[PDB]
Amino acid sequence: SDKTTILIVQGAVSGKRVEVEPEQARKAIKPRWPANDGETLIDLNDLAIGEGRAAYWEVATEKIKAEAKQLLRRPAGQQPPQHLSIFALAPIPLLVLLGAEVNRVDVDLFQKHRGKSADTWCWDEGEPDADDDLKVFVPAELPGEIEDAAIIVSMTSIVDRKAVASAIGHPHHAFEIKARKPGPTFLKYRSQLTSFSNELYTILTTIRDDFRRVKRLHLILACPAPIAVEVGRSLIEKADPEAHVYEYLSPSYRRVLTINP
């Protein structure tokens, strides 16, 4: 029941305004309570209007970096926030960036539950069923001199390996974390987020220890917002090479930003 700082992140590249209802996030953090009775907001709607997609990614990347730095700065006469409760609905690559930018502070991540119409941002009570766990596929071939490794998350849908190969444009190893039943309501319990984090850590450790020629990571994520944040949080600047982050722009994947270039 300690104090926490609520961070709301909301936006979209274009189209309908995306907003997080702060009353629902406040309900989700109970029994904890919001520092200053409020939230910090990073809004990523209506950036670079009419200027094209690349201008959006530029403006939004700089805004995420500047706002994360501001969020972690000491206010006058106070300490910096010690715990973030993050409620995010935003483009996947920007949430990877966000997770990397707040990786030095303790965080609680949350999922907007579609289908759970009350306590929408609250994690579900209960236990996961068999359709709710993960499968992890790793390369059949030895690392060798391959310089490129893809980390694929097939949670909201199945990622097509051929589209990944076309987007990466290099011979590569692939590691895949796949929902047993992919879909938009797969992620419901906090234990699933913990499971995902642990499986990703094992993959990153394997690449760091055994795939030492790998000079580029390629993150292809079909996953809910907190999973994208957790992917970003799991990167370690000096242990991992640059991580290229892709968006799904029908019918293909496109590289949109790089963590630790």
Tab-separated table of C-alpha atoms in Angstrom:
chain	number	residue	atom	x	y	z
A	1	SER	CA	0.000	0.000	0.000
A	2	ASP	CA	2.962	2.288	-0.630
A	3	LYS	CA	2.914	5.423	-2.748
A	4	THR	CA	3.424	5.025	-6.500
A	5	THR	CA	3.742	7.427	-9.431
A	6	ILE	CA	1.168	6.809	-12.170
A	7	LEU	CA	2.490	7.217	-15.724
A	8	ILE	CA	-0.104	7.243	-18.504
A	9	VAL	CA	1.178	6.848	-22.071
A	10	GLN	CA	-1.396	7.190	-24.852
A	11	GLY	CA	-1.380	7.694	-28.588
A	12	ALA	CA	-1.336	6.401	-32.140
A	13	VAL	CA	0.488	7.171	-35.376
A	14	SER	CA	-2.747	8.567	-36.835
A	15	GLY	CA	-6.496	8.094	-36.740
A	16	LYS	CA	-8.808	8.053	-33.741
A	17	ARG	CA	-7.608	9.613	-30.495
A	18	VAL	CA	-6.316	7.026	-28.018
A	19	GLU	CA	-6.856	7.837	-24.337
A	20	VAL	CA	-6.436	6.032	-21.026
A	21	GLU	CA	-9.139	6.758	-18.457
A	22	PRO	CA	-7.208	7.817	-15.310
A	23	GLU	CA	-9.996	6.754	-12.930
A	24	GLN	CA	-9.514	3.184	-14.175
A	25	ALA	CA	-5.747	3.301	-13.600
A	26	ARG	CA	-6.326	4.731	-10.129
A	27	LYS	CA	-8.634	1.808	-9.397
A	28	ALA	CA	-6.036	-0.597	-10.785
A	29	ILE	CA	-3.270	0.542	-8.436
A	30	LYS	CA	-5.264	0.035	-5.217
A	31	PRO	CA	-4.371	-0.570	-2.435
A	32	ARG	CA	-1.479	1.700	-3.461
A	33	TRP	CA	-2.245	5.383	-3.913
A	34	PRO	CA	-1.154	7.995	-6.468
A	35	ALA	CA	1.620	10.375	-5.532
A	36	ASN	CA	0.271	13.943	-5.652
A	37	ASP	CA	-3.241	12.447	-6.181
A	38	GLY	CA	-2.609	12.398	-9.934
A	39	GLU	CA	-0.611	11.097	-12.890
A	40	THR	CA	2.101	12.017	-15.360
A	41	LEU	CA	0.866	11.915	-18.961
A	42	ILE	CA	2.797	11.293	-22.168
A	43	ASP	CA	0.394	12.021	-25.021
A	44	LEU	CA	1.409	10.772	-28.470
A	45	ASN	CA	-1.733	11.729	-30.400
A	46	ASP	CA	-1.716	14.211	-33.272
A	47	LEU	CA	2.035	14.619	-33.623
A	48	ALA	CA	3.500	15.848	-36.917
A	49	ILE	CA	0.043	16.091	-38.498
A	50	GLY	CA	0.249	15.745	-42.262
A	51	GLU	CA	4.035	15.293	-42.208
A	52	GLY	CA	4.233	11.535	-42.815
A	53	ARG	CA	5.078	8.522	-40.705
A	54	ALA	CA	8.813	9.171	-40.302
A	55	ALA	CA	8.160	12.640	-38.873
A	56	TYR	CA	5.764	11.063	-36.378
A	57	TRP	CA	8.359	8.548	-35.211
A	58	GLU	CA	10.967	11.325	-34.873
A	59	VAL	CA	8.747	13.646	-32.820
A	60	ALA	CA	7.405	10.810	-30.691
A	61	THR	CA	10.854	9.323	-29.997
A	62	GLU	CA	12.160	12.678	-28.813
A	63	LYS	CA	9.041	13.226	-26.707
A	64	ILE	CA	9.352	9.825	-25.010
A	65	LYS	CA	13.014	10.457	-24.222
A	66	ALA	CA	12.399	13.975	-22.885
A	67	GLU	CA	9.353	12.981	-20.839
A	68	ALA	CA	11.012	9.906	-19.325
A	69	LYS	CA	13.977	12.062	-18.314
A	70	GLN	CA	11.611	14.649	-16.801
A	71	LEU	CA	9.645	11.937	-14.987
A	72	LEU	CA	12.774	10.577	-13.324
A	73	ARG	CA	14.172	14.029	-12.382
A	74	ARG	CA	14.154	15.168	-8.745
A	75	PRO	CA	11.513	17.826	-8.051
A	76	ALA	CA	12.719	20.682	-5.871
A	77	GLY	CA	13.195	19.471	-2.302
A	78	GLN	CA	11.931	15.965	-3.068
A	79	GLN	CA	13.307	12.632	-4.138
A	80	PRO	CA	12.838	11.249	-7.649
A	81	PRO	CA	9.972	8.784	-8.098
A	82	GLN	CA	10.852	5.370	-6.698
A	83	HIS	CA	8.097	3.329	-8.376
A	84	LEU	CA	6.144	3.779	-11.616
A	85	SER	CA	2.723	2.292	-12.313
A	86	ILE	CA	2.546	2.426	-16.110
A	87	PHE	CA	-0.728	2.430	-18.060
A	88	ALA	CA	0.088	2.449	-21.763
A	89	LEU	CA	-1.890	2.324	-25.014
A	90	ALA	CA	0.500	3.411	-27.756
A	91	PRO	CA	2.391	2.105	-30.800
A	92	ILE	CA	4.469	-0.972	-29.971
A	93	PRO	CA	7.892	0.460	-31.018
A	94	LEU	CA	7.418	3.543	-28.847
A	95	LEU	CA	6.557	1.336	-25.872
A	96	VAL	CA	9.756	-0.665	-26.398
A	97	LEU	CA	11.599	2.665	-26.350
A	98	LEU	CA	9.684	3.690	-23.211
A	99	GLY	CA	10.608	0.484	-21.390
A	100	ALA	CA	14.259	1.043	-22.236
A	101	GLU	CA	14.145	4.670	-21.054
A	102	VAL	CA	12.711	3.775	-17.616
A	103	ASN	CA	14.779	0.614	-17.150
A	104	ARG	CA	16.606	1.933	-14.038
A	105	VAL	CA	13.469	2.284	-11.869
A	106	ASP	CA	11.102	-0.288	-10.384
A	107	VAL	CA	7.836	-0.503	-12.354
A	108	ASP	CA	4.423	-2.145	-12.308
A	109	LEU	CA	2.960	-2.800	-15.763
A	110	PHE	CA	-0.741	-3.161	-16.520
A	111	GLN	CA	-2.964	-4.539	-19.272
A	112	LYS	CA	-6.195	-3.090	-20.610
A	113	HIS	CA	-8.409	-6.172	-20.449
A	114	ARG	CA	-10.677	-6.416	-23.464
A	115	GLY	CA	-13.601	-8.575	-22.436
A	116	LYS	CA	-13.208	-7.688	-18.750
A	117	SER	CA	-15.485	-4.678	-18.838
A	118	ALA	CA	-15.112	-3.783	-15.144
A	119	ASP	CA	-11.789	-3.221	-13.414
A	120	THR	CA	-10.531	-2.931	-16.984
A	121	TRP	CA	-6.919	-2.173	-16.109
A	122	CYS	CA	-6.903	-4.537	-13.124
A	123	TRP	CA	-5.111	-7.844	-13.473
A	124	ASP	CA	-7.572	-10.734	-13.427
A	125	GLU	CA	-8.120	-12.877	-10.393
A	126	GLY	CA	-7.793	-16.588	-10.975
A	127	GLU	CA	-5.195	-18.873	-12.477
A	128	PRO	CA	-4.140	-19.241	-16.123
A	129	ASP	CA	-5.427	-22.219	-18.066
A	130	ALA	CA	-3.488	-24.338	-20.560
A	131	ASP	CA	-4.227	-21.940	-23.422
A	132	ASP	CA	-2.577	-19.166	-21.379
A	133	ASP	CA	1.056	-20.318	-21.260
A	134	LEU	CA	3.993	-19.766	-23.632
A	135	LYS	CA	5.923	-21.897	-26.113
A	136	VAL	CA	9.519	-20.951	-26.941
A	137	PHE	CA	11.106	-21.890	-30.272
A	138	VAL	CA	14.871	-21.469	-30.677
A	139	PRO	CA	17.082	-21.931	-33.756
A	140	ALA	CA	17.742	-25.446	-34.994
A	141	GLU	CA	21.209	-24.423	-36.250
A	142	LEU	CA	24.370	-23.592	-34.325
A	143	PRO	CA	25.145	-19.861	-33.940
A	144	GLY	CA	28.161	-19.806	-36.235
A	145	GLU	CA	29.103	-16.486	-37.820
A	146	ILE	CA	25.536	-15.213	-38.329
A	147	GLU	CA	25.439	-11.550	-37.297
A	148	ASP	CA	21.665	-11.102	-36.915
A	149	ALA	CA	19.159	-12.496	-34.416
A	150	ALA	CA	15.406	-11.931	-34.477
A	151	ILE	CA	13.289	-12.077	-31.331
A	152	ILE	CA	9.687	-12.692	-32.358
A	153	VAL	CA	6.718	-12.428	-30.013
A	154	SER	CA	3.540	-14.061	-31.369
A	155	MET	CA	1.022	-13.184	-28.657
A	156	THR	CA	-1.822	-11.214	-30.229
A	157	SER	CA	-1.345	-13.100	-33.513
A	158	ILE	CA	1.076	-15.451	-35.240
A	159	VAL	CA	4.025	-13.670	-36.852
A	160	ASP	CA	4.874	-14.872	-40.371
A	161	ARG	CA	8.534	-15.920	-40.620
A	162	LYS	CA	8.661	-14.994	-44.323
A	163	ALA	CA	7.605	-11.408	-43.595
A	164	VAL	CA	10.223	-11.226	-40.832
A	165	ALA	CA	12.907	-12.446	-43.239
A	166	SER	CA	11.865	-9.885	-45.858
A	167	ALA	CA	11.949	-7.059	-43.308
A	168	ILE	CA	15.311	-7.957	-41.752
A	169	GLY	CA	17.218	-8.384	-45.009
A	170	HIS	CA	20.040	-10.485	-43.513
A	171	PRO	CA	20.607	-14.169	-42.815
A	172	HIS	CA	19.530	-14.537	-39.218
A	173	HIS	CA	18.711	-16.795	-36.306
A	174	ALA	CA	15.168	-16.588	-34.944
A	175	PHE	CA	13.900	-17.014	-31.373
A	176	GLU	CA	10.129	-16.982	-30.914
A	177	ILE	CA	7.931	-16.632	-27.834
A	178	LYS	CA	4.455	-17.778	-28.882
A	179	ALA	CA	1.174	-17.756	-26.995
A	180	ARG	CA	-0.339	-21.230	-26.904
A	181	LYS	CA	-3.610	-19.636	-28.076
A	182	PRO	CA	-2.668	-16.312	-29.716
A	183	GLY	CA	-5.274	-13.582	-29.639
A	184	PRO	CA	-6.301	-10.206	-28.223
A	185	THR	CA	-7.392	-11.584	-24.812
A	186	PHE	CA	-4.409	-13.888	-24.216
A	187	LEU	CA	-2.868	-11.614	-21.563
A	188	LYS	CA	-5.045	-11.556	-18.424
A	189	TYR	CA	-2.983	-12.499	-15.341
A	190	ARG	CA	0.106	-10.863	-13.861
A	191	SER	CA	1.722	-14.315	-13.737
A	192	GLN	CA	1.693	-14.314	-17.557
A	193	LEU	CA	3.725	-11.108	-17.594
A	194	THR	CA	6.187	-12.668	-15.160
A	195	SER	CA	6.412	-15.805	-17.318
A	196	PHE	CA	7.048	-13.737	-20.444
A	197	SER	CA	9.779	-11.730	-18.725
A	198	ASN	CA	11.535	-14.905	-17.565
A	199	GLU	CA	11.389	-16.567	-20.995
A	200	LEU	CA	12.694	-13.427	-22.675
A	201	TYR	CA	15.524	-13.270	-20.149
A	202	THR	CA	16.529	-16.836	-20.995
A	203	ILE	CA	16.581	-15.964	-24.713
A	204	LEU	CA	18.620	-12.803	-24.156
A	205	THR	CA	21.073	-14.715	-21.961
A	206	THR	CA	21.439	-17.399	-24.635
A	207	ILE	CA	22.204	-14.756	-27.268
A	208	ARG	CA	24.641	-12.933	-24.973
A	209	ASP	CA	26.536	-16.107	-24.020
A	210	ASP	CA	26.366	-18.368	-27.099
A	211	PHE	CA	25.513	-16.154	-30.099
A	212	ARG	CA	28.485	-13.828	-29.734
A	213	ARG	CA	28.824	-12.922	-33.420
A	214	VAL	CA	25.331	-11.366	-33.344
A	215	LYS	CA	25.737	-7.616	-33.866
A	216	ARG	CA	22.059	-6.707	-34.415
A	217	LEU	CA	18.847	-7.691	-32.668
A	218	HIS	CA	15.546	-7.453	-34.556
A	219	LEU	CA	12.434	-7.141	-32.403
A	220	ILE	CA	9.227	-8.213	-34.175
A	221	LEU	CA	6.425	-8.002	-31.614
A	222	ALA	CA	2.738	-8.845	-31.998
A	223	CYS	CA	1.868	-8.288	-28.364
A	224	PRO	CA	-0.043	-6.174	-25.817
A	225	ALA	CA	1.364	-2.854	-24.609
A	226	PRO	CA	2.872	-4.049	-21.279
A	227	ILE	CA	4.705	-6.859	-23.076
A	228	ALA	CA	6.262	-4.290	-25.417
A	229	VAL	CA	7.349	-2.195	-22.429
A	230	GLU	CA	8.828	-5.305	-20.784
A	231	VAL	CA	10.798	-6.123	-23.937
A	232	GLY	CA	12.286	-2.630	-23.853
A	233	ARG	CA	13.001	-2.891	-20.122
A	234	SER	CA	14.838	-6.195	-20.596
A	235	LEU	CA	17.518	-4.790	-22.922
A	236	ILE	CA	20.869	-3.905	-21.321
A	237	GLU	CA	22.753	-1.286	-23.304
A	238	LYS	CA	26.174	-2.743	-22.910
A	239	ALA	CA	25.286	-6.436	-23.052
A	240	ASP	CA	23.095	-6.349	-26.139
A	241	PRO	CA	23.934	-4.974	-29.581
A	242	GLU	CA	21.659	-2.392	-31.181
A	243	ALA	CA	18.035	-3.550	-31.281
A	244	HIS	CA	16.017	-2.664	-34.369
A	245	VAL	CA	12.296	-2.351	-33.586
A	246	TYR	CA	9.700	-3.047	-36.285
A	247	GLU	CA	6.076	-2.104	-36.791
A	248	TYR	CA	3.448	-4.142	-38.602
A	249	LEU	CA	2.176	-2.020	-41.500
A	250	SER	CA	-0.074	-4.309	-43.600
A	251	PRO	CA	1.045	-6.513	-45.100
A	252	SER	CA	4.704	-6.261	-44.070
A	253	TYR	CA	7.043	-5.326	-41.239
A	254	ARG	CA	9.071	-2.117	-41.346
A	255	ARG	CA	11.943	-0.981	-39.154
A	256	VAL	CA	10.991	2.185	-37.329
A	257	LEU	CA	13.524	2.764	-34.579
A	258	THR	CA	16.686	1.479	-32.913
A	259	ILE	CA	17.368	0.990	-29.195
A	260	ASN	CA	21.038	1.695	-28.359
A	261	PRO	CA	22.137	2.417	-31.968
